[PDB]
Amino acid sequence: EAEKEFITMLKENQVDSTWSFSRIISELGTRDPRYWMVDDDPLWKKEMFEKYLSNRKFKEAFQKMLQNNSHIKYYTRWPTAKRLIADEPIYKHSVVNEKTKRQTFQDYIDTLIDTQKESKKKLKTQALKELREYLNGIITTSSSET
């Protein structure tokens, strides 16, 4: 019962990864007495808090999940896109960690921004070229000569 409500109050107190267990004692100890309804086991509260932060080849799976998230963006920031990927199993792995997540994300953002800018530039350049090749398959005939 205690845990169930504790998870709910954690959402309601707007708690997430950007929180310490100081903010829990300071804000959750006052916002609603649920933190006191369940007796204070600071180690369980903090263990379960690690659950609330975590749950709330390895790198290839991470690179692949990044793309499979339907709203991922290469024109956005890590904290703004995190809500797309935190629930996904591939966000956790035996060798994955904060530093690995930053590297695989940065390489993904940099590669997908460049391929998109290049694809659009190429589309315009190719069509310009195809049109220009078309003028060179007929007699020249300058407009200036009437």
Swiss-Prot record:
GO process terms (BP): mRNA 5'-splice site recognition; mRNA splicing, via spliceosome
Domain of life of the organism in this record?
Answer: Eukaryota
Q: Which residues form the FF domain?
A: 1-55, 57-111
Q: Which GO terms of the cellular component aspect does the record hold? A: commitment complex; nucleus; spliceosomal complex; U1 snRNP; U2-type prespliceosome
Keywords (A to Z) from UniProt: mRNA processing, mRNA splicing, Nucleus, Phosphoprotein, Repeat, Ribonucleoprotein
Q: Which GO terms describe its molecular function?
A: RNA binding
Q: Does the keyword Mitochondrion apply?
A: no
The outcome of changing L128A is: Temperature sensitive growth at 36 degrees Celsius
Q: Where located?
A: Nucleus
Q: How does it assemble?
A: Interacts with CRM1, MSL5, PRP8, and the RNA polymerase II largest subunit (RPB1). MSL5, MUD2 and PRP40 interact to form the commitment complex 2 (CC2), a precursor of mature spliceosomes.
| Family note | Belongs to the PRPF40 family.
Report the protein's function.
Required for pre-spliceosome formation, which is the first step of pre-mRNA splicing. This protein is associated with snRNP U1. Two commitment complexes, CC1 and CC2, have been defined in yeast. CC1 is a basal complex dependent only on the 5' splice site. CC2 is a complex of lower mobility and is dependent on a branchpoint as well as a 5' splice site region. This protein is involved in CC2 formation where it binds to the branchpoint binding protein MSL5, bridging the U1 snRNP-associated 5' splice site and the MSL5-associated branch point 3' intron splice site.
- Written domain comment of the UniProt record: The WW and FF domains bind to the phosphorylated carboxy-terminal domain of RPB1.
Q: What is this protein called?
A: Pre-mRNA-processing protein PRP40
Which classification does the entry list for the species?
Answer: Eukaryota, Fungi, Dikarya, Ascomycota, Saccharomycotina
Gene label:
PRP40
Query: Could you say which residues of the full protein are shown?
Result: 134 to 292 of 583
